[PDB]
Symmetry: C3
Subunit: 183 residues, 3 copies
């Protein structure tokens, strides 16, 4: 049974038609919009990246934070340290959700080649709902230990929001967009 | 499917609730140190106490083995410690994955992809593995990494380290006093 | 103690016993090179023999494809291509190990990283088509070596049924310890 899940995910990830269907669904869930037609996975990654750049810049204004772009070496200025703390917290739960669904964190679609490539793919869909805003909220608060405050706040988001449980069907929905009968 | 997901939901329940997390961290402390965690200390405070005890243990080993030492830094001694702990982290990560848990959902260490690996490995690492690294560094051998690898294989085989890790993981999580899944 | 625990305990028994591990490594060598390793060689010595044969194979491939070659290492275009190809193969190899029910971190030739066994299994087959493909693409002087090589390697894995064929190879490699396989 776990083998069947892994073989399904790998099938999707290795077929260019199926990979694009999955990436299109990731885009659709991220933005609430059908993915633009006649665009490759690389083109969709570029469009997502320019929208994300714009989202960070708007959040910076909305929280009064000085900002030129996302940048980090865990370490950086306060805001970038906060964002890293928050997204790393989310990567942990996202990995648990991927494992819960029987899939491999390492086998991605938009991201590839790293231990958490599929984690990056999935976390990116939802990270702007509350996780990245919370990083900006903490940075603006400027508390004594901002990374710890981010961790505390994100653990509470995931506990209260049932993030893990909700991610599991989301991951299955993303893969089901390949239109291959799921396990 | 359902069983598989239930293990992860249990681990996350424990890790995301500040009260439950502290129960797990206090159990880890007691297993590691052979005495209870000080009362009225947060996980952050316990992490600092652990860190000071770890610095003291490295100091004591360096003094006993007669090895030059200026703290943990990620010459020969730090290379040997890294080789030894990497060996331990691999069998710990494998045990965690096989137990059905997520390596990234930790308790003392939180937010790196291997946080729970560090938590579990840290319970046992100073018993034999780190002392062995000192013994080998002190010999100043021609191939220290290989010597450390072979010694660590022998420690894990002779100590039944893997067979013990899986119940250890369950014992630690069970300290949250939530019903484990099937 | 359950099927997954049982498989891990089997793989770890093999990997931690110096005699069993050498039997496993000798099987890996035979599958890789199509002949038995020399008598009384240690794993370390066999790793060295593999290294020298690999150095020679890269040199031959460079000559055959007309690619400038200054050795294995962003680096030069050929090293970028080899790295993209082998990274792609690692992903499929990890999926195969996980599907077989075994641990990516518990290796035989390579030991001590989260992907040591992945590196062992990948090395058995990587010179069949994956590394030659890296040389073929490098010879085109691609502006996008990572993208082009991964496209090409996904097609190799899809068309060759690489993941499915790796599963029995992994099981056979472990079987060479002459310990009764699980269940
Ligand atoms: O546009 S900013 O000043 O809120
Ligand atoms: O220290 S080990 O050999 O039990």
């Amino acid at each position: 049974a776990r083998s069947d899940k892994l073989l399904y995910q790998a099938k999707l990830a290795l077929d260019e038609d199926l990979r694009l269907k999955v990436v299109r669904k990731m885009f659709e869930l991220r933005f609430g919009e059908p993915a633009p037609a006649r665009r490759s996975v690389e083109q969709l990654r570029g469009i997502e990246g320019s929208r994300v750049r714009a989202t960070y810049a708007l959040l910076a204004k909305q929280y009064g934070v000085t900002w030129n772009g996302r940048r980090y070496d865990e370490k950086g200025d306060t805001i970038n340290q906060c964002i890293s703390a928050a997204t790393s917290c989310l990567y942990g739960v996202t990995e648990a959700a991927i494992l819960a669904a029987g899939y491999a964190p390492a086998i991605g679609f938009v991201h590839t080649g790293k231990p958490l490539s599929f984690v990056y793919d999935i976390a990116d869909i939802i990270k702007f709902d509350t996780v990245v805003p919370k990083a900006f909220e903490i940075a603006r608060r400027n508390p004594g230990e901002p990374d710890r405050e981010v961790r505390l706040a994100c653990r509470d988001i995931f506990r209260s929001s049932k993030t893990l449980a909700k991610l599991i069907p989301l991951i299955e929905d993303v893969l089901a967009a390949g239109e291959i009968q799921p396990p």
